[PDB]
Structures are given as structure tokens and as C-alpha cells.
């Protein structure tokens, strides 16, 4: 009944802002299981709703890795929605802040990489008969 997951984003500073992009970072938002497993056994698709400044702001992934790589210059909230192969099982929605800018302690070491990830657990209190292929 309990499937653990890690979700969030990693990001890296270009080092110098790009001149006709304005972009300063490469980043990846993602959902992965806590340990290796094929989520696609039970995940139909994962939706990432990105900031509307992006094109095709709704990004749907149907096969792992459930991740999206992109470039940008601002921080914003990403809505991650996980739909299951049985539609009668309720989808799981997570909210994540795409983090790009590091703290001052970390700027002064000169770190180019930030990561903002969180462990979570998808709970199936009384799963579908079919959902017992989990």
C-alpha cells in the first residue's frame, strides 16, 4: 500500500548570463521512485505544469525517467500530477518550487549546482484490485 518517491529539481548556473536568452541556469524537475523500480508498471503519465512563460507549459511524460530539462532565469511553482493506470485510483498532486538561486553561504564557496528534492510516499489505503500490481 505505500510507494516511496523523491521529487524536486536540480539546477546549474551557466556562470555567465546568456545574451539573447537572458537565461542563467539549466535545470531538471523530476519524480523518481526512492529506489529502482519501473514506476510505469502503475503510472499512466506524469504531468508537469510549468510556468506559462514556457512553450507547451503542460509537459506530459509517459515513460521513465519522469524528468524535464530546460533553461531559465526565474523561480516558480511546478505542479506535478501523477495519474495511475487504473483511472479509478485518485491522482497524486505535488507542488514544488523550482529553485535556482543558492544561499549566500553557498555563493561564497562558488557552488554552481543547486538541488531541491524531497522524499514523499504515495499511500494507497485501499487500492484497486488492478492496482495490486504495485
Binding site for Mg ion (CB under 5 A): 111-113
* CB closer to Mg ion, 63 vs 112: 112
Closest CB to Mg ion belongs to which residue?
113
Q: Are 6 and 118 in contact (CB under 8 A)?
A: yes
Q: Are 98 and 78 in contact (CB under 8 A)?
A: yes
Peptide bond into 65 cis (omega under 30): yes
* CB closer to Mg ion, 18 vs 111: 111
In whole angstroms, the minimum distance from the beta carbon of 27 to Mg ion comes to 14
* CB closer to Mg ion, 18 vs 112: 112
In whole angstroms, the minimum distance from the beta carbon of 112 to Mg ion comes to 4
The three cell numbers of residue 63 are 515513460
**In this structure, what DSSP letter does residue 54 have?**
S
Amino acid at each position: 500500500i505505500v510507494k516511496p518517491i523523491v521529487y524536486g529539481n536540480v539546477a546549474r548556473y551557466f556562470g555567465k548570463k546568456r545574451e539573447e536568452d537572458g537565461h542563467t541556469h539549466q535545470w531538471t524537475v523530476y519524480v523518481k521512485p526512492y529506489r529502482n523500480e519501473d514506476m510505469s508498471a502503475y503510472v499512466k503519465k506524469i504531468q508537469f505544469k510549468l510556468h506559462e512563460s514556457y512553450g507547451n507549459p503542460l509537459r506530459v511524460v509517459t515513460k521513465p525517467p519522469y524528468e524535464i530539462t530546460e533553461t531559465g532565469w526565474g523561480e516558480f511553482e511546478i505542479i506535478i500530477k501523477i495519474f495511475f493506470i487504473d483511472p479509478n485510483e485518485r491522482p497524486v498532486t505535488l507542488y514544488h518550487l523550482l529553485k535556482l538561486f543558492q544561499s549566500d553561504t553557498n555563493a561564497m564557496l562558488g557552488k554552481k549546482t543547486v538541488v531541491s528534492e524531497f522524499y514523499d510516499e504515495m499511500i494507497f489505503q485501499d487500492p484497486t484490485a488492478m492496482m495490486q500490481q504495485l
